[PDB]
Homo-oligomer: A and B are copies of this chain.
Amino acid sequence: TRKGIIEGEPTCCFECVECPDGEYSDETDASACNKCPDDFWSNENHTSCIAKEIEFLSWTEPFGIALTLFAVLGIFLTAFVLGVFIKFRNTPIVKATNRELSYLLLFSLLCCFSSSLFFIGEPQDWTCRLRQPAFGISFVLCISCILVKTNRVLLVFEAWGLNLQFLLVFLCTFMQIVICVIWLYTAPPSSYRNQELEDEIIFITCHEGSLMALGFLIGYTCLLAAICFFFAFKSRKLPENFNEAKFITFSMLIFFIVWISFIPAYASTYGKFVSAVEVIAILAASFGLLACIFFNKIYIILFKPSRNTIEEVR
């Protein structure tokens, strides 16, 4: 509490008035209040200054707990599918869906699920620099593996030594990696201590250096997804590999629905939970692809292996 002038009365006759928020008076008979220093805010009685609460998506927060559980479950499912594909690597079903491409796709799916874990926790500089590029590269690799696994994609390109499948996935991912290198070399993101949205707490955000580069990452990812969707849709009715193109189409629609929904969800989320939505979108898309590429096959491989033959896989 500080002194206030009682009009007419001398200096020794003063009123007592409480300090405003953000200012404090530690000692008694104070003529003015003291603003709390940077990163500090007044306490509940304006008696002293206490540190502002540092807000971010926490690992121990129940929302973060659920998101970590879902990412762990996704990694577990991807490793399970990889294990099934490895033990049954000599079966016709695993041979048909190119085993090397399936292994690389599962590696990229593990990377996709793990990349969501770079959005939980207190944002550091390197974490913010790796968030967007990690998911971008991993998902471009996924869409490249799928996009060269379908019909009328490798044929049109082929019309050295290693398969053209790997050359195509390398080029498609290399464009993304070049974009990311240009980004983190010219305008890398950083960890920003935002003290403007709220006055009693400090948000920790990832300030992306160039929104042009982030837009380029997203545009390239969506362009590859659209190419994959179109080429699978032109061949969706084909029954090869247990209707592989139909499920590729399903996965691409799941991806597009997830990100079109990500638009308003991100544009309407404030505070720490913004990182939240990112994780969910990531997870969902990954899960989609995973299911649409493997669960069916996994069934036919583990249970009722009668169709695990060259004739049935067709």
The digit string for A5-36, where 1 denotes a CB below 8 A from any CB of B, is 11101110011010011110000000110000
| Chain B binder among A110-118, A179-187, A277-285 | A277-285
Which residues of chain B are near A261, meaning CB under 8 Å?
257-258, 261-262, 265, 277, 280-281, 284
* Contact A32:B11 (CB < 8 A) given known A264-B269, A273-B264, A280-B260: no
Residue among B11, B15, B254, B265 making CB contact with A265, cutoff 8 Å: B265
On chain B, the residues within 8 Å of A270 by CB distance are 268-269, 273
Contacts of A15 in B (CB 8 A): 32
Given the complex, which residues of B lie within 8 Å of A269, measured CB to CB?
264-265, 268-270
Residues in B neighbouring A3, C-beta threshold 8 A: 5
Determine the residue in chain B with the shortest Cβ distance to A31.
B5
Contacts of A264 in B (CB 8 A): 63, 262, 265, 269, 273-274, 276-277, 280
In the assembled complex, the CB of A27 is this many whole angstroms from the nearest CB of chain B, namely: 11
Interface: A209 (CB within 8 A): no
Give the oligomeric copy count.
Answer: 3
**Within residues 102 to 124 of chain A, which ones have a CB less than 8 A from any CB in chain B?**
none
Chain B residues with CB under 8 Å of A263's CB are 276, 280
- Give how many A residues have a beta carbon under 8 Å from the other chain's beta carbons: 45
Q: Enumerate chain B residues within 8 angstroms of A280, measured Cβ to Cβ.
A: 260-261, 263-264, 268
Instruction: Determine which of B2, B11, B254, B273 lies in contact with A11 in the assembled complex, contact meaning CB atoms within 8 Å.
Output: B11
Query: A92 to chain B: which residues have CB within 8 Å?
Result: none
Say whether A294 faces chain B, with CB atoms less than 8 Å apart. no
Contacts of A14 in B (CB 8 A): 5
In the complex, the chain B residue whose C-beta lies closest to that of A12 is B11
User: Across the two chains, which residue of chain B brings its CB closest to A249?
Assistant: B250
Q: A32's closest neighbor in chain B, by CB? A: B4
CB of A77 within 8 Å of the partner chain: no
Q: A261-B261, A270-B269, A280-B260 are in contact. Are A20 and B20 (CB under 8 A)?
A: yes
A residues with a Cβ closer than 8 A to B are 2-7, 9-11, 14-15, 17, 20-23, 31-32, 63, 246, 250, 253-254, 257-258, 260-265, 267-274, 276-277, 280-281, 284, 288
Known A264-B269, A264-B277, A265-B277; further 17 A-B contacts with Cβ < 8 A: A3-B5, A4-B31, A5-B5, A10-B11, A20-B21, A20-B22, A250-B250, A257-B257, A257-B288, A258-B261, A260-B280, A263-B276, A265-B265, A265-B269, A267-B273, A268-B269, A270-B273
Q: 22 A-B Cβ contacts within 8 A?
A: A4-B5, A4-B32, A5-B31, A6-B31, A9-B11, A10-B11, A17-B32, A20-B23, A257-B258, A261-B261, A261-B281, A261-B284, A264-B265, A264-B269, A264-B273, A268-B269, A268-B271, A268-B272, A268-B273, A268-B277, A268-B280, A270-B273
